[PDB]
Design a protein around this ligand. Structure first.
Ligand code: HEM
Ligand SMILES: *[C@@H]1O[C@H](CO)[C@@H](O[C@@H]2O[C@H](CO)[C@@H](O)[C@H](O)[C@H]2NC(C)=O)[C@H](O)[C@H]1NC(C)=O
Ligand SMILES: *[C@H]1O[C@H](CO)[C@@H](O)[C@H](O)[C@@H]1O
Ligand SMILES: [Ca+2]
Ligand SMILES: [Ca+2]
Ligand SMILES: [Mn+2]
Length: 357
């Protein structure tokens, strides 16, 4: 099919996604892997994972737009703290781009957001999820204080994900920050490159923790290797869950196996996202609209490196059967600040719509 705005696409139903991508980019992402993009990527997961094989369909419909369609329910659960921003940013698009279901909007918006992150894959995007569902129940969203056993069981119950797929999906923490874990600081990044979809998070979680970016007393947080902040450039935060996954015998080898393996990480993330994005649906009933996902920004191709103030002596290794790679260390004796903005600065307020969540 040829769209009215002269693009040839695979299927006529794909056409409406072209102006949607343009609108998302102009309005909330600005072609950046920044705050609003990150919040939308997080929403793809919180929307999709709220499904349970054991509890049955009444517990939730998976990748179904429930967060948008019932904005006063799940966003107010404690495990969904902070999801309101992404929900309130996407509702105006649901209202305007009113041939595309809420469910499809969430998954597509995440694919568009990710495409702005250098190194990210071009996600598969299937379309045709219905615009009617139910609100999910509480307890379906993993929390950072949870054990590895609890996390792996949650993902197995949601969609049969293997531990390999779970760790693969945590490549998203390469482009991720925390606003609610510590009430005293905002935008605390999980790696030193929160605007780049690289392997730094896998490396940096394996370093010895030396302090905290804010207070020392927060649920779900453990000591960070890069805690220095100044102004709006908040220090790195480490989640208890990521730490636990990096060291648990079930997942340690998988965790380590992504260090300095960018193409493998990106391909693995793409494969697990293909499964996540269709939870609650039979993929044989969704049309392939992958050609309307924007082409992602390329990586520079550089290897992973130890940040200044760290090195191999700081590693806490847990995989007996795989050799840890030889990596360089960035020069300097003290830690560099992790910039608050993609252009290196301190200030870059994003667009935020008011709304019902
Ligand atoms: C065991 C599983 C996981 C746990 C416990 C977890 C936990 C968290 C927590 C606590 C935050 C910080 C929220 C805040 O305080 O503002 C966060 C942020 C984030 N998470 Fe995860 N997460 C998990 C899996 C995932 C997966 C599977 C994805 C997506 C594929 C994802 C994508 C993100 C993104 C992109 C952010 C950053 C949001 C922003 O920077 O504004 N997470 N996660
Ligand atoms: C999916 O459902 C939503 C929510 O019912 C629909 O949203 C409404 O969209 C119309 C325009 O079509 C607006 O006048 C309303 O204000 C929206 N409602 C709410 C509660 O925001 C949406 O149109 C539906 N989309 C599809 C593809 O059927
Ligand atoms: C980032 O900044 C630190 C100092 O904060 C340096 O040691 C490093 O070399 C880089 O310039
Ligand atoms: Ca949902
Ligand atoms: Ca990164
Ligand atoms: Mn945030």
């Amino acid at each position: 099919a040829v769209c009215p705005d002269g693009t040839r696409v695979s299927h006529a139903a794909c056409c409406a996604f072209i102006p949607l991508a343009q609108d998302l980019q102009e309005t909330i992402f600005q072609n950046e892997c920044g705050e609003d993009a990150h919040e939308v990527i997080r929403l793809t997961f919180h929307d999709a994972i709220a499904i349970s094989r054991s509890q049955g369909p009444k517990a939730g419909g998976g990748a179904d737009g429930s967060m948008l369609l019932f904005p006063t329910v799940e966003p107010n659960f404690s495990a969904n703290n902070g999801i309101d921003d992404s929900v309130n940013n996407l509702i105006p698009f649901m209202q305007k781009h009113n041939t595309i279901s809420a469910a499809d909007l969430v998954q597509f918006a995440g694919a568009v957001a990710l495409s702005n992150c250098p190194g990210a894959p071009r996600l598969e995007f299937l379309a045709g999820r219905p615009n009617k569902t139910i609100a999910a129940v509480d307890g379906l969203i993993p929390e950072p204080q949870d054990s590895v056993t609890k996390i792996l069981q949650r993902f197995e119950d949601a969609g049969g994900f293997t531990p390999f797929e779970v760790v693969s999906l945590l490549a998203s923490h390469s482009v991720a920050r925390a606003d609610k874990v510590d009430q005293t600081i905002d935008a605390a990044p999980f790696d030193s490159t929160p605007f780049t979809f690289d392997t730094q998070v896998f490396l940096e979680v394996l370093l010895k923790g030396v302090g905290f970016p804010g207070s020392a007393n927060n649920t779900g947080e453990v000591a960070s290797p890069l805690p220095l902040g100044s102004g709006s450039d908040t220090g790195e935060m480490r989640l208890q869950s990521d730490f636990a996954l990096a060291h648990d015998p079930r997942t340690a080898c998988i965790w380590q196996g992504f260090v300095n393996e960018q193409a493998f990480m990106a391909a693995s993330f793409r494969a697990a996202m293909s499964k996540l994005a269709v939870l609650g649906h039979n993929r044989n009933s969704l049309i392939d609209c992958s050609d309307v996902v924007p082409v992602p920004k390329p990586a520079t191709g550089q290897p992973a490196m130890f940040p200044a103030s760290t090195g191999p002596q700081d590693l806490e290794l847990s995989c007996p059967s795989e050799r840890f790679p030889t990596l360089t260390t960035q020069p300097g004796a003290s830690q560099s600040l992790i910039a608050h903005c993609p252009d290196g600065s301190m200030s870059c307020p994003g667009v935020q719509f008011n709304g019902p969540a």
